[model samples]
Target: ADSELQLVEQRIRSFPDFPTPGVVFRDISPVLKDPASFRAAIGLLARHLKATHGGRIDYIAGLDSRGFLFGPSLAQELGLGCVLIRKRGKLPGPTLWASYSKAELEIQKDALEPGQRVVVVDDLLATGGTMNAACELLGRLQAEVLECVSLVELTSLKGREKLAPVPGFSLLQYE
Candidate 1:
C-alpha cells in the first residue's frame, strides 16, 4: 500500500520560484503522464473514500483546472458523477459564489441536487482558503461535504488548519 503511494510521490517534480518568487511549485504533470503512477494515485484516493464514506458519496466536486484532471477518473473509479467548481463567469447558468483570500469560486446552481453529498478535489493544498470557500459555497447550495482532498500538501504551511471541521486528505506531503 505504501509503495503504491510512493510511486506516485516520486513522480512529482518540483520547481523553485514558480507561479511567483520565493514559491516552490510541486508539479503532478509527470505523474499524470505516466499511466502506472497515475493509476496508483487515483487508486489510493479511491481506497480512502471506500474505506470511509462508501455509498454515502454523491459526487466528486472538482476544483477548477487541476481538480478536473483527477475528479473525473476518481468519480469514474467510484461509479459516481463529477461536478465542476469553476471560476466566476466560466459557467453560463445560474451559479453560487464564495469568496476566498485571493479570489472567488463559483459552482452551477444545478450542479448538485439539494442535500447531496460531495467530496471536493484539487491538485494541491497550499492554503485552505480556496477549499474553505468551496465548502462555504457548497453549504449555500445545501450540499453536504464529506471531505476535501488534494494530490499534494505543503505540510509546513499547515493548510489543513483552515479546514477544521471539514477533514482533509492528501496523497503526498512535502516539508
Candidate 2:
C-alpha cells in the first residue's frame, strides 16, 4: 500500500501563492493526466473503502468540479450510484441545495434518502470549509455522511479538526 501510494505522491505538483498569496496549492491534475498514478489512486480508494467499510455505503457525493473526478469511478467500483454536488446555478432548478463556498454544488432533491450512508470525495482537502458545508447540506436531508476521502491533505491547515468525529482518509498528508 505504501509503495503504490508513492506513485501518486510523485505526480502531485505544488505551486506557492496560487489563487491567493501565501497559499500553497497542490495540484492533482498532473496525476490525473498520468494514467498510472491516476489508476493507482482510484484503485487504492476503491480498495480502501471496500476493505474498511464493507460496502454499507448507499451513495457517494463528489464535490463540485474536482470531486467529480474520482467520485463516480470509485462509486462504480464499489457498486453504488454517484451523486453530483454541483456548483450554484449549474444544476438547474430541480437541484437540492447549492450553497456557495468554493462554488455552488448540488444533487437533485430526491437523490438521497434519510438514513442513507454517503462518502464525500474530493481531489484535495485543505481548510475543510468546503467539505464541511457540503456535509452540512447533506445533513439537511437527514442523510448520514459516512466518511470523507481526499487525494492529498494539507495537514498544516489542521483541516481535519473541523471534520472531527467523521472518519476521513487521505492518501497522503502534507504537514
Candidate 3:
C-alpha cells in the first residue's frame, strides 16, 4: 500500500527558495505529466477515502485551479458527484461564500443539499486559509464536510491545525 505512494511522492520535484528566499516549493508537474504517476496519485487518494469513509460520501468539492485536478477523478472513483468551490463571481445562480482573511470562495446554492456529505480536495495544503474558507462556505450551504484532502502538506506551516475538527489528510508531508 505504502510503497506505491512513496514512488508517487518521488515523482514530485522540489525547488528551494521558490516564491521567496526562505520557502521550498514542491512541484507536481512531474507526476501530472507521467500517466503512471498521475494514476497512482489518484488511486492512492481514492483508496484512502474508501478505507476511511466507504460509500458514505456524497460529493467531492474541489477548490479552484489545483483542486480541480484530482477532485473529479476522486469523485468518480467513489461513484459520487463533484462540485466546484471557486472564487467569487466565478459561479452563477445564487452562491454562498466565505472569507479567508483576504479572498473569498463561492459555491452555487444548489451545489449541495443540506447535510450532504462532502470531501474537499486540493493539490496542496499550505497556509490552510483557502481550504478553511472552502469548508466554511460549504458549512454555510449546510453541507456536511467529511474531511479535507490534499496531495501534499507543508507540515512546518501548521496548516493542518487550522482545519481543527474536520480533519485533514495528505499523501505526502514535508517539514
What lDDT does each candidate get?
0.91, 0.84, 0.90
Off by over 4 Å in 2: 98-104
Off by over 4 Å in 1: none
Sliding window of 10 residues with minimal summed lDDT for model 1: 93-102
- Per-model TM-score on C-alpha atoms: 0.96, 0.91, 0.96
Decide which is better by lDDT, 1 or 3.
1
lDDT of 2 by residue, 1-175 (tens): 7777988999999899998998788999878898988888998998888888887989889988899999988888888999877766777556666454445556678868899999999988887878877887788788899889999888887777877777778998987
Q: Residue 108 in model 2: shift from native, Å?
A: 1.9
Q: Order the candidates by lDDT, highest first — what do you get? A: 1, 3, 2
After superposition, candidate 3 runs with Cα above 4 Å error: none
lDDT of 3 by residue, 48-156 (tens): 9999998899999999989999989888888888999998989878888777787978889889888899999999999899898899888988889999999999998
TM-score of 1: 0.96
RMSD of each: 1.0, 1.8, 1.1
* TM-score, cand. 2: 0.91
Q: Point out the worst 10-residue segment of candidate 2 by lDDT.
A: 97-106
